[PDB]
Design a protein around this ligand. Structure first.
Ligand SMILES: [Ca+2]
Lengths: 59, 235
């Protein structure tokens, strides 16, 4: 619950009533289905490498 | 950057270079389409300056470069309140025309005060720039990057005669040999959080570069997080 492992929040964690965890994400992101992970809500969200040198792997 | 490595095209899409009276004189980071965050000591003279995003090799053409003119410079209101101290070494730059975000032009994430400071305390971040790679050397043609460990505050104080304020933090290795350097100012100290990078510092100053027993000093972004968001709002 934020206490341990950021309370299972990929980005931010906050403590709600009844020791409940409420996750949140930064601009350009949205709370993934599980209510923990953060997923892109825009074509080019801050902080991520999308180039990946064209294509030189499994992809 | 001294002792670092060549970045790969698009590895640090938020990194920009600043050109003016001197070419590649400092670095910066994209806050958003219209704003760049850098170091105040890089833009005191308010002279004409240019910004190049999507830059990789400063003497070649990648066709990913986006140049823009700076029409407004906002250094931190307390920078130089006490002459020559480098405290509050942070500045914001507004662009004439908005950048078009793509794979080589992406903003850097900026968390709140509490989390920015939490990410910094992870103790490991990357610094990048086209600054010097060697003693008395010129700009690096290819963007360089280096991973630098955070330094306990007490060790920081004992490493320099100059005052290290709570608006700054030390980073570097005990042995030296790896450091950000002249020309890298304004550049970002970023902390990688599960595939997502956050701005935790602004390359600011030091004593020479890479010297053993010395450390790079960075502006502590967490302290200016509210100031950044308030000034760079899109309308
Ligand atoms: Ca180029």
């Amino acid at each position: 619950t934020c206490n341990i492992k950021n309370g299972r929040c990929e980005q931010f964690c906050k403590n709600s009533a009844d020791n409940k965890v409420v996750c949140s994400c930064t601009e350009g992101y949205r709370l993934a289905e599980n209510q923990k992970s953060c997923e892109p809500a825009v074509p080019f969200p801050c902080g991520r490498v999308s180039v990946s040198q064209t294509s030189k792997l499994t992809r | 950057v001294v002792g670092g490595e060549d970045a790969k095209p698009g590895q640090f899409p938020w990194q920009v270079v600043l050109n003016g009276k001197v070419d590649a004189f400092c670095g910066g980071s994209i806050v958003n389409e219209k704003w760049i965050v850098t170091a105040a000591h890089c833009v005191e003279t308010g002279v004409k300056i240019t910004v190049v995003a999507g830059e990789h090799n400063i003497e070649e053409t990648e066709h990913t470069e986006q140049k823009r003119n700076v029409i407004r410079i906002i250094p931190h209101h307390n920078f130089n309140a006490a002459i020559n101290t480098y405290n509050h070494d942070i500045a914001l730059l507004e662009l004439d025309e908005p950048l078009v975000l793509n794979s080589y032009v992406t903003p850097i994430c900026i968390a709140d005060k509490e989390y920015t400071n939490i990410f910094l305390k992870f103790g490991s971040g990357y610094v990048s720039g086209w600054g010097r790679v060697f003693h008395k050397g010129r700009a690096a043609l290819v963007l360089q990057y280096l991973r630098v460990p955070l330094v306990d505050r007490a060790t920081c104080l004992r490493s320099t005669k100059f005052t290290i304020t709570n608006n700054m933090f030390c980073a570097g290795f005990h042995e030296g040999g790896r450091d950000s350097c002249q020309g890298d100012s304004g550049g970002p100290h970023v902390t990688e959080v599960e595939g997502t990078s956050f701005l935790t510092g602004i390359i600011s100053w030091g004593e020479e570069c890479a010297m053993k027993g010395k450390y790079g000093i960075y502006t502590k972004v967490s302290r200016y997080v509210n100031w950044i968001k308030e000034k760079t709002k899109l309308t």
